[PDB]
Design a binder for this molecule. Structure first.
Ligand SMILES: NS(=O)(=O)c1ccc(N2CCCC2=O)c([N+](=O)[O-])c1
Ligand SMILES: [Hg+2]
Ligand SMILES: [Zn+2]
Length: 258
């Protein structure tokens, strides 16, 4: 049938409906810290979320997205390897069924517990659907999550997961401040990639932050109680909604540090 992360519709079957899966700039990738080139021409990352306006949280059957009001230059990301401004449209996670897997990007073949992706689109393109049609249309900020101490700013996300347990369910989720999810350092690795879930459009400029954020075992656990299925259908827990690392091919991962 249609895509997912199960044995019969998982990552290894996506190339049949979306031939771009075997593309030239696919994400995620394994970041080799010793092969990544330090580039001093890379400017600092500029995250301006002080005027962020969260609107809703939704379970789309592949994960839960927290959507923001992107009708104005409220929550933007600029600087880094980017040219111009990018509006935060939404953020989501990708976790595992166990604490030793869940991240999509790996650092030195190392996988973390999960991975937050704050999706952004280039404003010089008007809307989101026009950005996915250009090679520099999106900038996803990747933040790894490791199990350890709780993350206060992530708790308001965790408590509303009961009301979006199944596919297609939503809930009013305003006043969330994404700044409470950012690690202390903004060091990062950037590289040209794509979406990690279908359509798998090669339109992303990936900015994977070097520093991870810790979340309690209790916080990641409550992610695993969500379901892929819609209401009234046989329960399938939402776990391992991550794509395996892809070939780097004709690409170079740059770093803003040494
Ligand atoms: N996992 S990622 O961040 O690569 C990612 C995965 C999927 C999507 N899309 C595309 C259509 C709806 C949606 O959620 C995006 N995206 O916003 O482009 C991002
Ligand atoms: Hg594109
Ligand atoms: Zn993602």
């Amino acid at each position: 049938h249609h895509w997912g992360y199960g044995k019969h519709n998982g990552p290894e079957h996506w190339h049949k409906d979306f031939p771009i899966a075997k593309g030239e700039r696919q994400s995620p990738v394994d970041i080799d810290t010793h092969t990544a080139k330090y580039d001093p021409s890379l400017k600092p990352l500029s995250v301006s979320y002080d005027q962020a306006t969260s609107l809703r949280i939704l379970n789309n059957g592949h994960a839960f997205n927290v959507e923001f009001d992107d009708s104005q230059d409220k929550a933007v990301l600029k600087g880094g390897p980017l040219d111009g401004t990018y509006r935060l449209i939404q953020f989501h996670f990708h976790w595992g069924s166990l604490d030793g897997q869940g991240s999509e990007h790996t650092v030195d073949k190392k996988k973390y517990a999960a991975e937050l992706h704050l999706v952004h689109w280039n404003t010089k393109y008007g809307d989101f659907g026009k950005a996915v049609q250009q090679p520099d249309g999106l900038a996803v900020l990747g933040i790894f999550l490791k199990v350890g101490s709780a993350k206060p700013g992530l708790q308001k996300v965790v408590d509303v997961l009961d009301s979006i347990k199944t596919k297609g369910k939503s809930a009013d989720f305003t006043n969330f401040d994404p700044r409470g999810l950012l690690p202390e350092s903004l060091d990062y690795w950037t590289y040209p990639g794509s979406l990690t879930t279908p359509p798998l459009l090669e339109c992303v400029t990936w900015i994977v932050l070097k520093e991870p954020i810790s979340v309690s075992s209790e916080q990641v656990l409550k992610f695993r109680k969500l379901n892929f299925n819609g209401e009234g259908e046989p329960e399938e827990l939402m776990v391992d909604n991550w794509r395996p690392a892809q070939p780097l091919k004709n690409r170079q991962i740059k770093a803003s540090f040494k």
